[PDB]
Amino acid sequence: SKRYFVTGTDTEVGKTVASCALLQAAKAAGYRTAGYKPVASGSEKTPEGLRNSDALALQRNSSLQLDYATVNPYTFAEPTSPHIISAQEGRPIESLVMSAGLRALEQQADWVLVEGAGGWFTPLSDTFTFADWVTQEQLPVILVVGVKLGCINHAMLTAQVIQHAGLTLAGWVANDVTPPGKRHAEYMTTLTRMIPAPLLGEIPWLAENPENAATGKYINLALL
Amino acid sequence: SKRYFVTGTDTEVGKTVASCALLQAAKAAGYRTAGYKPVASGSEKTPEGLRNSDALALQRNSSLQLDYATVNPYTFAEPTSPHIISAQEGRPIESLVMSAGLRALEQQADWVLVEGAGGWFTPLSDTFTFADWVTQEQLPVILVVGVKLGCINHAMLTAQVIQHAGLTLAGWVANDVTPPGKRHAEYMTTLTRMIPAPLLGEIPWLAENPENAATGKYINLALL
Numbered sequence: 001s002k003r004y005f006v007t008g009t010d011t012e013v014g015k016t017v018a019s020c021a022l023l024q025a026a027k028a029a030g031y032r033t034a035g036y037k038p039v040a041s042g043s044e045k046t047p048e049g050l051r052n053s054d055a056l057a058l059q060r061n062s063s064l065q066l067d068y069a070t071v072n073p074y075t076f077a078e079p080t081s082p083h084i085i086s087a088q089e090g091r092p093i094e095s096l097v098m099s100a101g102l103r104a105l106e107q108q109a110d111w112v113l114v115e116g117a118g119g120w121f122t123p124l125s126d127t128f129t130f131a132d133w134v135t136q137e138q139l140p141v142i143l144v145v146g147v148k149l150g151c152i153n154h155a156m157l158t159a160q161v162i163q164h165a166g167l168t169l170a171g172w173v174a175n176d177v178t179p180p181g182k183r184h185a186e187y188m189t190t191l192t193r194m195i196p197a198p199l200l201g202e203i204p205w206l207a208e209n210p211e212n213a214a215t216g217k218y219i220n221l222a223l224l
Numbered sequence: 225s226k227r228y229f230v231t232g233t234d235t236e237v238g239k240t241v242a243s244c245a246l247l248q249a250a251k252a253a254g255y256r257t258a259g260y261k262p263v264a265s266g267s268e269k270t271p272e273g274l275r276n277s278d279a280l281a282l283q284r285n286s287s288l289q290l291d292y293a294t295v296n297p298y299t300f301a302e303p304t305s306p307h308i309i310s311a312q313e314g315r316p317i318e319s320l321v322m323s324a325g326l327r328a329l330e331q332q333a334d335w336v337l338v339e340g341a342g343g344w345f346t347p348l349s350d351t352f353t354f355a356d357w358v359t360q361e362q363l364p365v366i367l368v369v370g371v372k373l374g375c376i377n378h379a380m381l382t383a384q385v386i387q388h389a390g391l392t393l394a395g396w397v398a399n400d401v402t403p404p405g406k407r408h409a410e411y412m413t414t415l416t417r418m419i420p421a422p423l424l425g426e427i428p429w430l431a432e433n434p435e436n437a438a439t440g441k442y443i444n445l446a447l448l
């Protein structure tokens with residue numbers, strides 16, 4: 001299987017909207033797809049247990065019918081850093097459970113997208129970060145950049161740390177989190193020059209429910 | 225002279241409020257102080273020319289009476305990345321002018337704080353970033369962390385890139401940009417464990433005009 005890890009320049013830059021666009025393009029290409037969000041914090045109560053909205057988006061944009069626990073093994077109610085609520089609840093986030101989950105998806109899907117939580121360095125325990133697990137798995141990384149003032153600094157910090165860890169930055173996606181503003185073209189030119197990876201596409205500002213929008217068309221999967 | 229460069233985990237995390245606190249503590253220690261903001265974008269019109277508010281804060285928190293142009297040689301009206309408006313206006317930001325300005329302050333002050341613009345990697349031209357000038361000058365760096373969800377990732381990205389450039393991370397300052405929230409103690413413990421530099425102090429959430437507040441007391445200059 002082809003496998004990709006999706007990270008963002010910050011929490012809340014639209015990493016899930018860009019992951020749904022990527023899944024929609026891979027399905028259109030004829031791949032058997034599966035989204036995977038191993039760890040999620042910030043979840044709602046239902047009859048079946050806690051459900052996270054981002055993991056639900058990944059589950060319904062996958063071409064295979066998947067059970068929720070397969071998409072998201074670790075679900076926490078509180079919207080904070082996963083290491084804080086893991087310790088609080090007495091539920092360790094185990095690297096072997098996160099890896100087994102990835103393998104289980106690979107039995108049925110040939111194109112798997114793995115979405116982390118928050119940014120690159122999100123702690124999972126007091127001695128282990130999400131970055132350590134991605135390095136261990138040797139996943140190529142796609143960076144989602146929310147285009148706003150301050151995103152050049154955050155895109156270059158994340159890009160350099162991934163290359164320092166000896167991983168492949170497979171590409172980047174520009175996500176328009178605000179309406180058209182005055183220096184949009186110049187920001188897109190600087191970002192294209194500075195990130196050492198192909199620009200895979202640009203998702204426009206979509207006011208109403210953008211993870212349910214048909215966004216596959218904004219991604220050029222040929223460059224991956 | 226003692227010289228320090230102050231950077232932030234993002235634009236608008238309170239780097240100027242923390243720089244005014246640092247200047248107030250150094251004055252209380254008996255140093256002859258000068259703040260320096262070489263490049264500023266986002267300025268108001270006055271009879272004397274354009275004036276940036278952050279540079280004005282640095283100028284009035286300095287113990288020496290300094291002229292505005294000495295504090296801030298490069299002033300741009302538009303609140304965008306300095307390389308965009310520099311090119312637009314036909315006014316190159318010269319590394320030799322930025323360095324001469326630092327030396328001119330060193331003739332009269334024995335404790336100089338240098339504040340950049342935005343985050344670490346802010347571009348000054350198409351081939352030159354603020355990070356290149358700080359490396360060239362070999363300035364020790366103080367990191368200001370606005371405490372909010374996502375700041376662990378941004379504090380660790382910036383910390384690692386500065387150490388990769390062979391510079392000293394002299395310390396960090398926690399700035400409380402929001403009112404007391406639920407996981408504040410756990411965020412302060414994680415940040416203290418993860419940033420490889422002393423915590424110099426914590427500035428509380430100050431609703432009304434915090435750069436005019438007397439904040440020197442929250443900084444322990446002994447650890448610098």
Ligand SMILES: Nc1ncnc2c1ncn2[C@@H]1O[C@H](COP(=O)(O)OP(=O)(O)CP(=O)(O)O)[C@@H](O)[C@H]1O
Nearest residue numbers: 011012013014015016017118176204205206207210
């Ligand atoms: N193209 C777009 N147009 C309009 N709104 C967008 C958008 N992309 C993202 N958003 C909005 O920004 C917010 C964050 O988006 P999203 O849920 O995809 O982020 P994310 O995956 O980075 C969150 P986390 O850090 O918790 O993993 C959402 O409310 C979403 O609707």
Ligand SMILES: Nc1ncnc2c1ncn2[C@@H]1O[C@H](COP(=O)(O)OP(=O)(O)CP(=O)(O)O)[C@@H](O)[C@H]1O
Nearest residue numbers: 235236237238239240241342400428429430431434
């Ligand atoms: N301790 C605090 N309490 C309340 N508000 C604070 C605060 N620290 C910073 N702020 C507010 O956050 C905003 C940004 O602060 P500040 O001007 O110091 O940031 P900064 O220097 O990072 C800006 P730039 O990126 O343009 O250099 C201001 O409106 C300021 O009043």
Ligand SMILES: C[C@H](N)[C@@H](CCCCCC(=O)O)NC(=O)O
Nearest residue numbers: 150151152153264265303341342
């Ligand atoms: C306009 C901002 N407020 C700030 C400069 C921000 C540059 C951000 C560049 C980037 O996107 O990383 N200006 C200043 O510090 O004077």
Ligand SMILES: C[C@H](N)[C@@H](CCCCCC(=O)O)NC(=O)O
Nearest residue numbers: 040041079117118374375376377
């Ligand atoms: C609660 C957030 N929305 C997100 C996790 C953010 C962790 C941020 C850690 C940090 O401060 O760097 N959750 C999630 O992606 O499910």
